C-alpha cells in the first residue's frame, strides 16, 4: 500500500514535466488514474503555478484584446500576475482556462517606461518571426539591479493531427551604463504521436554583452540579437538535423551494410572467418 504523500509526489513529476499540448490531458490522465480528486487537485494546483510560469503561455484577460505571457517575473506573489503592456494586475486561475477580475496598477515605472518602448517594438518583430506570436516584457528590480525581461512563445496544438509544436524564449537585459549584460535561454519542443512517438527537445543558452545608447537603438539592438540567434538556431535546428541526424543516426545503424549489399543469409549460415 503506497502512502498518500507518495501518490502526490508521483503525480507532481508528471505534471511538472508534461508536453503542453497534452499537459491538461496529462493532468486529466493523472486524475483519471487515482480515484480521489482532492489529493491530486490540491497537489496539481501548486504544480500548475510553477508549470504555467515555465511555459511562458499567455492567459487572455477578458477585455484586453491581447495575450499576456505568465512567468516568474510577472509573479506579484499574491497569486496575481503583471501585464506590463496594458499595466493592469490579473488573477490567473490555474485549472480553468481564463484569468479574470483584474486590478489597475500604478507604479513610478522609470526603469519600466524605458523598456516598454523596447517592448512594443519587440512585438512587431515577434509578429515577423511567427504567424501567431504572443509576448510579455516584465519590468522589475532584482537585488538592486535593473533588468528588462522580455519573453516570447508560440503554441501550435491540434488534436486530430497528433503533433504539437511549442516555442518558449527567455530573455533578460540588465541596464548598466555604459556596458550592459544579457542572459537568455531558448527552448523548442515538438511531439509527434501517430503509429508511435517522436519528440524534438532543445535549448540554447546565450550570454551577451550590449552597450546602451538610445531608446530607438536599444529597442532595435536587442531584437536584432534575438532575430539572428533564433534564425541561426532554427537554421541549425532544421538544416543540421535533416542532414547530420541522417548521418549520425546512420553512424549508429547504417541504412545498408559496409558492403552496400543486402546481407546474404545463405552466406552467413555456411561461411567461416578468422585464422
Amino acid at each position: 500500500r503506497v502512502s498518500d504523500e507518495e501518490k502526490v509526489r508521483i503525480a507532481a513529476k508528471f505534471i511538472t514535466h508534461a508536453p503542453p499540448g497534452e499537459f491538461n490531458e496529462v493532468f486529466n490522465d493523472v486524475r483519471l488514474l487515482l480515484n480521489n480528486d482532492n489529493l491530486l487537485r490540491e497537489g496539481a494546483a501548486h504544480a500548475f503555478a510553477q508549470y504555467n510560469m515555465d511555459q511562458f503561455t499567455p492567459v487572455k484577460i477578458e477585455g484586453y484584446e491581447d495575450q499576456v505571457l505568465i512567468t516568474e517575473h510577472g509573479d506579484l506573489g499574491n497569486s496575481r500576475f503583471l501585464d506590463p503592456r496594458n499595466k493592469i494586475s490579473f488573477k490567473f486561475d490555474h485549472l480553468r482556462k481564463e484569468a479574470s477580475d483584474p486590478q489597475p496598477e500604478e507604479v513610478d515605472g522609470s526603469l519600466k517606461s524605458w523598456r516598454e518602448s523596447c517592448d512594443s517594438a519587440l512585438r512587431a518583430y515577434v509578429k515577423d518571426h511567427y504567424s501567431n506570436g504572443f509576448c510579455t516584457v516584465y519590468a522589475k528590480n532584482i537585488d538592486g539591479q535593473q533588468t528588462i525581461i522580455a519573453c516570447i512563445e508560440s503554441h501550435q496544438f491540434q488534436p486530430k493531427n497528433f503533433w504539437n509544436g511549442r516555442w518558449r524564449s527567455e530573455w533578460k537585459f540588465t541596464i548598466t551604463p555604459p556596458t550592459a549584460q544579457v542572459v537568455g535561454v531558448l527552448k523548442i519542443q515538438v511531439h509527434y504521436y501517430e503509429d508511435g512517438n517522436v519528440q524534438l527537445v532543445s535549448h540554447k543558452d546565450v550570454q551577451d554583452s550590449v552597450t546602451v545608447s538610445n531608446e530607438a537603438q536599444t529597442a532595435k539592438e536587442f531584437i536584432k540579437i534575438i532575430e539572428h540567434a533564433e534564425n541561426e538556431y532554427q537554421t541549425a535546428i532544421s538544416e543540421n538535423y535533416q542532414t547530420m541526424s541522417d548521418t549520425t543516426f546512420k553512424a549508429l545503424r547504417r541504412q545498408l551494410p559496409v558492403t552496400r549489399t543486402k546481407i546474404d543469409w545463405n552466406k552467413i549460415l555456411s561461411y567461416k572467418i578468422g585464422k
Partner: protein, 270 residues
Amino acid sequence: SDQQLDCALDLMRRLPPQQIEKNLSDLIDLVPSLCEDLLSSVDQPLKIARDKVVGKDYLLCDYNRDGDSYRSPWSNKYDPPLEDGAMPSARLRKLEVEANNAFDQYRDLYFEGGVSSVYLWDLDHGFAGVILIKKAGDGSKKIKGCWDSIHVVEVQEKSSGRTAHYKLTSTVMLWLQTNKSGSGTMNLGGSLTRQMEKDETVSDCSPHIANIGRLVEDMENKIRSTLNEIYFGKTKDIVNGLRSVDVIPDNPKFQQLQRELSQVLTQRQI
C-alpha cells in the same frame, strides 16, 4: 481499473521515453494493483545480462526468462541456477544456436558494435523467436545515442508442402541526443512499431531462420526509413512553420500568387 490501464499506457505514450524505467517504477508505486499488467504491456529499454561461464553479454526479455532467472543463449543455463527451468527441445536448441550465430553476423554488419541476444521458445505448431539488439553511440562525442531492437517472430509450420506462415512484430526504441555546432543541443526520442506477415516455402538450402531474417532485414530497412521521415516530416514543418523569417515576405508573395493561381485556374479550364 481497465480505464486506469488505458490511462497508464496513455501516460507512458506522452512522458519522455528516455525515462521509462523511472516513470514506470513510479507508475507502479502509484498503482500497485496494475504492476503485473504494466510490466507486460509497457515496453522498456532492454536489460544487460552477463554469462559468467562463457564470458559474454546477453539480453533479457519476458519470453526467455522463467521465474527469477534468465536462460543465457550461449550456455543454455539460467542465472541464478534453477533446478528444472523451461528449456527448448534438443532440435530447437541446435536451431537456436544457429539463430544466435546468424543474427550475431547480422548485427555486427549493420551496427559494427553493441550487443545482441536471440531466444526461441518451443511451440507445438511452430517455433517463435525474440531478437534483441542494443547498440550505444560514441560516448566521447557530445552527441549521445542508442538503437534498440525488439523483433518478435512467430512461425507457423505447415504439415504438407513445407511452407511457413511468419508473423513479425518489430519495435524500434531510439533516443538521439545532439550536442554540437555551437548553436544549442537537441535530444530526439522515437518509438515506432510495425507488423509484417508472410507465407514462404521452406528450402533445404536455406533454413527457416534465414526466412525469418529476410523479414528483419527488409523490416529494418523500411522501419528505419519510415522513422527517418517521421523525424523530419515533423521536426521540419512544425519548427519551421512556427518561427520562419521567410514566412512574412513569402506571405505577401503567396497573396500575389493567390491572385495569380486564380487567374491560372480560369485559363487552365479554357
